[PDB]
Amino acid sequence: DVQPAARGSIVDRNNDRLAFTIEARAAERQDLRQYPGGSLAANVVGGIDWDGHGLLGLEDSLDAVLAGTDGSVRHKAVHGSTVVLTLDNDIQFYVQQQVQQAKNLSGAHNVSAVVLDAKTGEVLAMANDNTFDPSQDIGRQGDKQLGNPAVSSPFEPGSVNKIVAASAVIEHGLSSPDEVLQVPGSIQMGGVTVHDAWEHGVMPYTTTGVFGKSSNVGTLMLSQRVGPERYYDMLRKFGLGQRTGVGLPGESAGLVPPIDQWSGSTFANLPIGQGLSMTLLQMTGMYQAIANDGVRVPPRIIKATVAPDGSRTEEPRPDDIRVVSAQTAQTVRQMLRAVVQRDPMGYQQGTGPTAGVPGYQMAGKTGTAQQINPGCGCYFDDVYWITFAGIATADNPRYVIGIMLDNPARNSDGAPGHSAAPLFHNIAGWLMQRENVPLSPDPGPPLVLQAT
Template structure:
């Protein structure tokens, strides 16, 4: 038994480690230590030499911040320097709701007497913001707010708004407590000084720069000027067509930020200054634009028309002095609500072509005089109808064969007499004249959405094409193109493409005049003078009626005016044929006729009454109103009196 127990017990000699065992253990330790050192050395080499540059760059990127210095958007001015659109610096108050509770709770722990707890603090901010900014809390008195909106919604042309009209404290509180959101804008358009006061009192809020685009004239000229969106990009109008140059080029710099959020001294680099956007001086006359726009609003309401638009050009330069339409949207308001209210953001004068009707007869008159196929006083025997290539065309009034002078053909607006003269010209010559007058071609006026109109190409003319074109049907043109025809006649036969830009102003203040389009000779100065005199017959009045034109009674005492009325049948979309009840009513004229200063084109879409609410559907009274205002504003000298009357019917 004792021997067995003895085998389970080791003696002290047996417990002693032999030198060989010690050496083996030391060798193993050295081996594993060497492996560890090799791993560390490899890791160090890998970090320092292989991935070190990438890690260094990543660390650099984490602490590098690029600060953007936003360029200021260029202004848009009228021809007299009045501001049509400009940028005002303001602030947006923003917050990071996801981290707001943690920030407030930490401040509350450190300064419990000065910083309330989260719920109380957010409630305090929501209530205090409207007071500091100086606007109404929309939730404070909803009944009073309802009355306020009813009284302030009426003004048509609001002044520049430098701050929001009201703030909802409930909406602010909701944003502050939305802990799933990492970023919220509490209020926009805040005065910089008031924004500074807000963040001074509530450091958990952030004041961010916000450039506000101002349109101080409301809806006046908005169809031309356009509007930018919340992202600062032009949405329509001139703001869109010249967006890149108006925006300018943002500047900026790079700096390194330490862990405490403070910029590391000496780390600023890659500094490049902002280049503010180019400013534009347009050819528009703000006062004239306002007057014309108001006249169109009244004319549309009085006549019951679907639309009304007008263009006023400088007779010699082709510059657009006014380009207006009724019911233009106000860019200071919500565009969605403006459109819902029936207002428009389009510019129909350049984008909506239409058949001009008899206004286009001046092309036939100019070509006939230029080619010598007739004279103003030639007497034509004009039947009640004419057949051309199987198409029968009649005058607007029934009559047997009557004698009209060439002047009378246009003064009375005889379709038959016009086609008789067009036949003398021939189809090829007439097609050439359409091209010379710029029809079927874009004017390149630097406004978006311009239509080139529609003129059938000469090889595509069918039998009835030549029976329609000389009387203003079978082709479509924009109001700008239509007005441009008369500008050619006003400018002694030279067509100058209309333009809207007068000059550009660089960010350093350098002003550069816009290039003048190359003129196109259409007819001779003698022909243009003769045609202007002939078309004075349109506005001539005569007690007997025989020598009265289609626009009789719309002259201006002391001035000689010339122009042409137009009535164009619209195409019925259901039948595809010309309607007998739907019309474009047009007028284009020159004032004064003897020394042209202004060219005015007008289009009314389906009026049911006159522009003053009277009977008839002529646009001539509106031409008279606009011309009288323009002549008075620019102090245009009176015309030399004409001796006698023009002979329309012998």
């Protein structure tokens, strides 16, 4: 009497299969969910329950699309539609592996990474370490990551948030990359005292140097030019505090205190990335806006669906959001090249020189945010979220890469320190090689971070 719907498959952007059903035997007919890549993108894909319906991930959030409706004899069975993700399996595989070995080499509690297409915001890779294997019983995998922290688990961003301040001082004509500043080693602001990660007297940092060296004091002085209203407006325009609508279950909205609830010290904290939280995806989406000439395209992982006949419907594109002018975006892309600039004299070196890839105008920003002590209601002194976000490349944005390390003892590559810059180096360099993207013989002249 019953005519069963055949579950749809989940494939990547080139129709490479992530999950698909085969017919088998034991009721007697029994359909088996196949996961050829095992753990590949399982944080996104999810896994099957006993009855062949989704248990978690997109298998469950898109179950109705994937499961179809059973027929009867008279009503025809509607077989499940196929879901085409924006993921590129080759990129996801490389990224997911690097993320696992960044966690191993650095001693972090977790490591995650997101790769966006610069112009379109599509999610080309989304990975975390320790990813469960959906071809195996979930109940034996309590020691595994069963979910998708890149969208579900916000953190305080620290210094990667400085893109907002930088975008606001440029867009509002309030400063320029080459402006020579005078930056003390500390200031009192909003009732509190803010210090730079190194002690120094008044330093002739350019605006380029404030972000390339990640001066908190410098960021805040430039932020006083913007004011709370214009800065809070730029936060909101950058997408923070609000879900992206990427199409993944369990997405968090993060957390931005609204301006009418600020305390006297909120403005002293937000421009340096403390006092607010965001997801890795929101973090990478901020850099997507800048990569896309100031136009933010909310990220999306569902590319299209194919009906049982074979007809394809593309997913509807989200509307553009104008965060900053194209001129502003280009100027911020170029400033951020200072973060990867190397200088043996130290003077004109940014915080993330290991992130540069020679022959390419790489551009990014490091961060080191303090985590909250759960048994205190106060910040740890030596527990951090490490964070990197970058664009490949400044002069021709193709890829946006966002990385977070949960409190590593070492670099992502195992060298001493605490930086995520080596992992951006690995992934961005590999993305350029595999597309045979051409080098550039001249990098331009070095950027000036520090005047006289």
